[PDB]
Design a protein around this ligand. Structure first.
Ligand SMILES: CC(=O)N[C@H]1[C@H](O[C@@H]2[C@H](O[C@]3(C(=O)O)C[C@H](O)[C@@H](NC(C)=O)[C@H]([C@H](O)[C@H](O)CO)O3)[C@@H](O)[C@H](O[C@H]3[C@H](O)[C@@H](O)[C@H](O)O[C@@H]3CO)O[C@@H]2CO)O[C@H](CO)[C@H](O)[C@@H]1O[C@@H]1O[C@H](CO)[C@H](O)[C@H](O)[C@H]1O
Ligand SMILES: CC(=O)N[C@H]1[C@H](O[C@@H]2[C@H](O[C@]3(C(=O)O)C[C@H](O)[C@@H](NC(C)=O)[C@H]([C@H](O)[C@H](O)CO)O3)[C@@H](O)[C@H](O[C@H]3[C@H](O)[C@@H](O)[C@H](O)O[C@@H]3CO)O[C@@H]2CO)O[C@H](CO)[C@H](O)[C@@H]1O[C@@H]1O[C@H](CO)[C@H](O)[C@H](O)[C@H]1O
Ligand SMILES: CC(=O)N[C@H]1[C@H](O[C@@H]2[C@H](O[C@]3(C(=O)O)C[C@H](O)[C@@H](NC(C)=O)[C@H]([C@H](O)[C@H](O)CO)O3)[C@@H](O)[C@H](O[C@H]3[C@H](O)[C@@H](O)[C@H](O)O[C@@H]3CO)O[C@@H]2CO)O[C@H](CO)[C@H](O)[C@@H]1O[C@@H]1O[C@H](CO)[C@H](O)[C@H](O)[C@H]1O
Ligand SMILES: CC(=O)N[C@H]1[C@H](O[C@@H]2[C@H](O[C@]3(C(=O)O)C[C@H](O)[C@@H](NC(C)=O)[C@H]([C@H](O)[C@H](O)CO)O3)[C@@H](O)[C@H](O[C@H]3[C@H](O)[C@@H](O)[C@H](O)O[C@@H]3CO)O[C@@H]2CO)O[C@H](CO)[C@H](O)[C@@H]1O[C@@H]1O[C@H](CO)[C@H](O)[C@H](O)[C@H]1O
Ligand SMILES: CC(=O)N[C@H]1[C@H](O[C@@H]2[C@H](O[C@]3(C(=O)O)C[C@H](O)[C@@H](NC(C)=O)[C@H]([C@H](O)[C@H](O)CO)O3)[C@@H](O)[C@H](O[C@H]3[C@H](O)[C@@H](O)[C@H](O)O[C@@H]3CO)O[C@@H]2CO)O[C@H](CO)[C@H](O)[C@@H]1O[C@@H]1O[C@H](CO)[C@H](O)[C@H](O)[C@H]1O
Lengths: 103, 103, 103, 103, 103
């Protein structure tokens, strides 16, 4: 298994590490049908999503998708600095694969 | 996928953006049969619901409805300022589709 | 849909509004078989339960029962003032149908 | 339904009330197979478990077991004083049936 | 049942106690397919994982794996000092079996 977010991110195609080093500026959550998703933005202007669950996801990802949304909300609310995001860059906005935080 | 709440809200009919820019004044939660719902009010006087799950909801929305209720409670309790709500205006009170918070 | 706890509470029989305006004094939680329930008391001496799930509950209430117990715990722990409780008065102690909090 | 932890505890065999009146000293959580359990200790030296789910549990207890572990963690982390524990004394360490907290 | 993390850890093969006595330095969470996992590091330079769920896990562990990831996040966020980790040493990085915290 990978030992860092960067190492994990390299195990995939169409991914890149964004070094954020900042707390989340805005949190957006939708329960509208077909748009069950979370959107986060930063001071940098960069916007990121957790995608709507769909056929691009395998079973093992369903709970992890829910976990990521849980993490984004509590990260937002505690003003916790996110270190890095591993994101897929074939989606608009870029889609969150992994998150890291340092303290 | 949409990049902001406003953009997401535009992908639906009978929706409008309320710019709230305030913490939640009151939180009401019900486990009474056929009224399994949350109601939030603001200082502005405006009241909003998360609807009882029903036939107007698709399967993908069940977990998101529960998420929205989770978010409203923790938002309330932390006195977090809500920025915008995307709501359906063909329900009374208006029904929450999406929420945003800025920091 | 109702716009306030009081309005919601009036849609049912054997219910009444208790104006609490206080934080929870004691929180009791049981995982003993047939007594999977939460009990709360106040400084006023009044005691309230979330009933054990049973045949008086419809399916849509299962998740809401669990939510109400979640809310009672976090409310207790944060010393959050409860405003009102809608309770069923044909149970001993009185059984929680809805809760409100103002800030 | 019972109105206090003590009253609830008396509806069972092999149970006793421990008056703790203290915050949790240590929290131990295991995800090892056949040892999916939580252990808590106190300054008094007394140790308590939430048992591994097994055939001694009825269906209605599955969620309540998970709730009890949730409560123990958040209680530990907030340094919340536990008042009383209703425990089964036919297990080693004694097994948690109910918990109460006063404020 | 075991009464301490050390005692529990001894009921398994390929395990060892790491005495950490420190808060978590970094928290990494991934929802990428086949890498649904959490990684934590410490100031000591030691890295640990909660493994991706797979055939090495029995059914009773599914909920416990999710709980462990919940605990790591909230532990990280509250800067709570971990005391000990029971870890499997036949995985890279070492894989978390149990955790303890003292206060
Ligand atoms: C790049 C891509 O299409 N990914 C989609 C994936 O396709 C699989 C293979 O992609 C990789 C990858 O994601 O980069 C290759 C990695 O080595 C794998 N990494 C690890 C650590 O296992 C991952 C991983 O297995 C999956 O992501 C987990 O589900 O997959 C890709 O190389 C392979 O391509 C085949 C192709 O299918 C076939 O038509 C052609 O004949 O040959 C190609 C070259 O071999 O296909 C793999 C699956 O068959 O498939 C998943 C569903 O399994 C998704 O569709 C994924 O798309 C991304 O999904 C993300 C969410 O998980 C997110 O939405 C991204 O935006 C999507 O692009
Ligand atoms: C307006 C309406 O009745 N919406 C109900 C919806 O109906 C479907 C179509 O809905 C839209 C919409 O809701 O605005 C159109 C959007 O482009 C869609 N957006 C996206 C991003 O896909 C949404 C979305 O797919 C759904 O909301 C997700 O469930 O749907 C609606 O336009 C369509 O109307 C047809 C009509 O049926 C047909 O006779 C006629 O010839 O063509 C019309 C369009 O040209 O019907 C669609 C259903 O097949 O359906 C959902 C559940 O399926 C809801 O019932 C929705 O009502 C709202 O539900 C909300 C909660 O999700 C909330 O309760 C609101 O108050 C409800 O009005
Ligand atoms: C009062 C009562 O007995 N409630 C039980 C309920 O019975 C149903 C009807 O009750 C009402 C009510 O609770 O006030 C009537 C309301 O208008 C309804 N309000 C709304 C917004 O929907 C509610 C609501 O539907 C339910 O609470 C949700 O399940 O129900 C009751 O009037 C009706 O009695 C009829 C009977 O059906 C008929 O055959 C007889 O001959 O005459 C009566 C009078 O016309 O029966 C309804 C059910 O068929 O049913 C639910 C289960 O669905 C429960 O059993 C409920 O008991 C309460 O449950 C609470 C928690 O949910 C709590 O434990 C209380 O202590 C219980 O009394
Ligand atoms: C004491 C005991 O062995 N309990 C096990 C239980 O057995 C049932 C009866 O237990 C009581 C009890 O716990 O004291 C009696 C109480 O009045 C009941 N209280 C309420 C509110 O219902 C409880 C309760 O029903 C259950 O605990 C909920 O699951 O049960 C016990 O009296 C009865 O014993 C019979 C025996 O079966 C029969 O052969 C003999 O002829 O007469 C005896 C006296 O009537 O059996 C009852 C069920 O068959 O069953 C549960 C699960 O079904 C557990 O096995 C329980 O063991 C405890 O489980 C705890 C966790 O829930 C914990 O791990 C303890 O360490 C276990 O002892
Ligand atoms: C060492 C190993 O490979 N363990 C895998 C396990 O194998 C079972 C036995 O493992 C023990 C153990 O892990 O120490 C023995 C303990 O006494 C048990 N402890 C308790 C408290 O009950 C545990 C426990 O029951 C399991 O973890 C339950 O999930 O298991 C192992 O001794 C036994 O090996 C046999 C072999 O099968 C047989 O061919 C040969 O003739 O004799 C051997 C030695 O007597 O096999 C047992 C299974 O039948 O199986 C589990 C899944 O059931 C895992 O695969 C486990 O591998 C580890 O899994 C961990 C996560 O759970 C982690 O990822 C580690 O990295 C894996 O090594």
């Amino acid at each position: 298994a990978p030992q860092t977010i960067t190492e994990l991110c390299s195990e995939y195609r169409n991914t890149q590490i964004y070094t954020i080093n900042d707390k989340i500026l805005s949190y957006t959550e939708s329960m509208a049908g077909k748009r069950e998703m979370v959107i986060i933005t930063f001071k940098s202007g960069e916007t990121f999503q957790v995608e709507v669950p769909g056929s691009q996801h395998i079973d093992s990802q369903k709970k992890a998708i829910e976990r990521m949304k849980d993490t984004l909300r509590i990260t937002y609310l505690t003003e916790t600095k996110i270190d890095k995001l591993c994101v897929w860059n074939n989606k608009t906005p870029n889609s969150i694969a992994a998150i890291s935080m340092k303290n």
